[PDB]
What we know:
Chain A is an alpha+beta fold.
Amino acid sequence: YARPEWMIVTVLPVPPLSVRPAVVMQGSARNQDDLTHKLADIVKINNQ
Amino acid sequence: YNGFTGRKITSQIFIGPTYYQRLKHMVDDKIHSRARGPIQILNRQPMEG
RNA sequence: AAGACCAGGCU
């Protein structure tokens, strides 16, 4: 159920859209959740 | 004197003019009821307010 | 939309 090397992050889970819903605004744009912005930063730095 | 029967009231009641204030709080602005209305987006639970 | 601050009410 729990092995010590699993406590080190190798694969980072991405929560579904339900966990981090987009903010509907008048139909013109979506604002994005804090989780979405943090994941964007993480993906950018991982790609770099 | 009793308004309903016209008989005197045994006790003598203290009466007189006093300055009274109506307050902002009214029941029409406070009464509220809910049955399967709007649902919160994230929790899928009933709205607040 | 959502978040923030503020003010007030009933204990």
